[model samples]
Target: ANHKNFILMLIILFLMEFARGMYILSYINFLPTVTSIAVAITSLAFSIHFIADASTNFVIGFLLKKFGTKIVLTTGFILAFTSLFLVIWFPASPFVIIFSAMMLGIAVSPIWVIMLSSVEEDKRGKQMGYVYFSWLLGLLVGMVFMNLLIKVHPTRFAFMMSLVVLIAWILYYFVDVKLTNYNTRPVKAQLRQIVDVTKRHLLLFPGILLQGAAIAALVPILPTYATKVINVSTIEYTVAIIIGGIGCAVSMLFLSKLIDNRSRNFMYGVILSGFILYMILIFTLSMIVNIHILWIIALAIGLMYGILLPAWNTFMARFIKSDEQEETWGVFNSIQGFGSMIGPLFGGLITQFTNNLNNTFYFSALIFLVLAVFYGSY
Candidate 1:
């Protein structure tokens, strides 16, 4: 039912993602300059958040089944709220940041599960565009504004994000649809079902992990690389992100339709190749100090991800049972979460040790190429 409840859920999703985007964007951009934390350690803190989230993905299914969406999601937002407050009060504390990251990580996975599971199979691809549109737009707006505000009034921006999370938490009560039971099974039976489904689609495992890793590996370094290495102004970087975000958001609907109607395997191949090409271009052209080219590259990458996301999600959805939806999605997400956990750490450590940001893109491209070849051959 695409009723009032679904729309409400989407709104909550948007707010939650927006708050999350602001927190993360702030963490990466503000932490090093605002605090005495080393750049690599900041990156590690970023990854630690993913690590908590990824680790939680393993059990989020169980939590959803036992507690249902309303309780689980509420707990998540509460954690999210606490996490942001931690940021505001303890900006300099890595221990607090890591703890906040874990809480935020647990909070995010449920929204994805709830969104994907709520949609019908036939409309899964097409409707999911709306889901991602909300997510991307939230991130885009949050990043754009937080980029402006955090620089000017760091503590206030952090407070504002906490308020945003509070709004999301309040909005949760209005959405009754999300409260439906996920058809809980015996714990052992649920785990067995999840493991069985995952085994049947084993080839996708590596691609999924690499997918999260390759994207995340770039996260910790984007701002620094754009400002320090590429010598782009904040306006330039922000504009590029906006254009790319717009491109990605706009393209998702069309791409989702294509996924629903076309050969997903072929589409995935083309998209993966696009990722490989775009990353390579970024690696080479970024050296030329061309902000305009980066914008174009950003748009291309955005469109590529717009195509990849629904296809990948729908591809995974095929193997999941309605009765076990949460469990199976949790498993898949957990795998990718593991990749996310390591990605920033890899990027940060490499960048710190080598004192060069350019290689991260090159390394990201290598990972994409491997995925492309692996999937294309399969």
Candidate 2:
């Protein structure tokens, strides 16, 4: 019965993520038409989004423990809806856009932490897969769907995304989330608890931070590298992303169970090795012009991500006690969030100095190699 509730919750989450993805796509499409400052506006929106969201991590964690999942998630949906509503009605307002980005940042902050909190420890890996699968599937669907609709008219796309958000918001009430007893301690005391826990598990911080860093580093380079260096057509590049997303989603459904049922250390070792090799392959394969090879690499890389997320998360989850779920996860994510903020700048600087985008892959590969050795020794 509880397991059934998980699915219901995931469906709601899937819809919410879909709306969020569509919201981004619609805004990006709408921005260029309305402003001569197209790229800068989008960058500002995302920068505000990340910093606002990242700054709220601890507060969100506290809110989750105090108010429970239902209230917190409902609040997120409300913010998300309002964010979309702003873009739909006031598409050209800079103030509205900046405020919308702030809302979106805070809105998406609590979701994954709440979802991970509910997973049964015995089924952690498999259920983590379900969570990510829903997330990825929703994002892929929304991005693809919005991409097509934007070619028609972005206003129509915004309306569609709003409808999706509205449906998701309505679904929120139906999902049964158990409320926890409010943490009676004040914020300071609760934070101290999280800090103490972090101190004990300090060793895991590098892996946590590197995961976000590597991902964000690729963000600025992915499109340019795929199109210019590999000579992939714009359509083919989009296709490659969809293929990768599908591969990750599907593999998480099956491959993640390997982490739960078998030796976790061994699985982590294998996945990390695969991650290193995969990055290296991306660097080498950049010299080739085959879209098919790109697709194959994308799929393989996706599979590695599939296994890596659950395994890495499950490992980190073990270090935090049951009572510390929200706060600890929030702090851990904040660390990763900072890495993400730094990553694009780091990648861009390297590309600027080296005059080679492929070098980013090599650098990320080196990070993973060090991580592998670090995890292996301990």
Candidate 3:
């Protein structure tokens, strides 16, 4: 049953990845061709999605206490599948696309909450490694396949891809597994507890907020920066992403084992190592005149990302007791969603106001530096 559950999860991950890939391809294509229509819609869509994600955490916590993980996850899949259909059918309509994206965000939220909460404390590092590995693999495959489809068949490809994922989701419906309710709180009580816990952990929120700001500022801007500032071609941009994907995949696979064996200090050391490497590349290499060197630095950045992500995830999971796992993860993910919302907004404002791309990277680096300090104190 455990094995079946794992396979079912992998399938769910694949479909989720497929949906994401299609969304990205469609979004990027739609944005450039349209007169910022898609961008406006997506911006609003994601903003709502982000807030919904944070707000839903407490609701999901309540639901998890009442219903089992399986039912919640099944519901998530259904919403995601429905969203895919809406987007595929109304590919050209910004309103439809936005609505679909919003639904997808809400549907996927609980799946993540359940998946992370399912991990046993003793095996969290290893379990998260497996989960992330599946996630990155899905992402890589989805991007590659979707890109190929777009290149080969411009029209109808997105719809076809969505259909394929939806079918896979249907197959997932049949897999049976035990559904454990991680939380046992009622809705009203859960809401009160969340407020109380959040108030008690007020200092932690800033660190989380900083994390959101840092990553959000940089992630959306990187492809643009690679093309404009570094003078990389579209092919190079794709290659850089693939390279980074590989780095993330490898790091997710191995980092868990290290965390499982080592002390928190040791994990902190790994994160710092990654930070130092990224800082050096960003400050020194990005300033260099050679485009080729920048590409090399891009690969280095990917490697650093590989090391940093899993360590940070595992470290955060360590903060609460086993019973509090759902709320803990919910708060963490909510803060991340909040950070993501803030990061890109701040990045966009900085770029628009200053009319400089370099400022974004520096801002991102500063946020990371602060995170490093936060981690050090822990």
Candidate 4:
């Protein structure tokens, strides 16, 4: 059953990654035309999405108790697949796109909740690493392949990719696995569980929010940073993404071992060190950097990302009891979602005020440095 579930998770991870890549690539590529409107719409949509997602975290625990993991997981996949179809079939419409994004968020929420719950507590670090690695790999492949496909066949590419994910969703059904349902707990009980966990790991929220903000602020501006300020070629964008993806993959590989062997204090140190390195790199890049060094910067950032992300996830995972896995992971991810929503908005505002992209990094660096020190001290 574990093996079957692992395979199902693998497929689910791939599909999710693929769909995310598609949405991001397509959105970024077309964003300039609708940049003004998209900024507001996407932000608002994501805010709502995060709230709904977080709410569902508690709801899933209830649902699991009432229904079962299989039903919840299947329902999520169906909603996700349907959202993908809608986005592909109806392009450029703000209403459809926003609704699709929201639905996509809703659909994907339960998979995360379930996957975290399904893993044994002893092996969760390794399991999460594996899951994240699959996710990163899927993102890398999806981005490159979808871009290539669209280049050759623009109109049908999105639909084709959606079809592929749909097939993966179908394959998920046959995988045999037992899911835990904590539905016997009432809503109040679930809320209490969530609150207790949060209180214990209260520090985690700020760190995650900061990390999310940093990534969000950088996402829209990075390409421009590379192309304009650094004056790198368009190809550099892909190279940077691939390099970063590799870093993310490598970080996951070592994270489990680190968690198992290291003390919590040691793990916290590692996270702080990585965060500091990232801040230094960003600040330095902002100060005086040649275009040729952009690739190196990308690689370093990737490695930093690799370390920081898994460490953060592992750290947060430790705070929750095994039974509260779904709720905890959901809340954590929702915080990330909130950060995602705010990061770009903040970045845009910073850019508007500073009149340059380089300053954004400095702003991010300052915030992260402060957060890192605080987390490290705690």
The top-ranked prediction according to lDDT is: 2
Candidate 1 per-residue lDDT over residues 67-116, each given as its tens digit: 56677887787788888888777777777766776677678888777766
Q: What are the models' TM-scores?
A: 0.74, 0.83, 0.78, 0.77
User: Which regions of candidate 3 are displaced past 4 Å?
Assistant: 1-4, 25-28, 31-39, 46-58, 120-122, 152-155, 164-168, 174-179, 182-187, 198-200, 227-266, 353-378
| Ranking according to lDDT, highest score first | 2, 1, 4, 3
- Model 3 worst lDDT window (10 residues): 25-34
Itemize residue pairs with steric clashes in candidate 1: none
lDDT of each: 0.67, 0.68, 0.62, 0.63
Q: For model 3, how does the per-residue alpha-carbon lDDT over 1-64 read when each residue is reduced to its tens digit?
A: 7556666765676567666665553443444353446546655765665577766765675466
lDDT of 4: 0.63
Off by over 4 Å in 4: 27-67, 87-94, 120-125, 182-203, 227-265, 355-378
**RMSDs, each prediction?**
4.9, 3.7, 4.4, 4.7
Candidate 2 TM-score, C-alpha based: 0.83
**Any residue pairs clashing in model 4, and if so which?**
65-183
Looking at candidate 4, the ten consecutive residues that score lowest on lDDT are 27-36
Instruction: Give the TM-score (vs. native) of candidate 3.
Output: 0.78
The count of backbone overlaps in candidate 4 is: 1
Single out the weakest 10-residue window by summed lDDT for candidate 1.
Answer: 259-268
lDDT of 4 by residue, 133-213 (tens): 777777677777777776675545667666766877787778764565545446566566565655467555677676677
Query: Which has the better lDDT: candidate 1, or candidate 3?
Result: 1
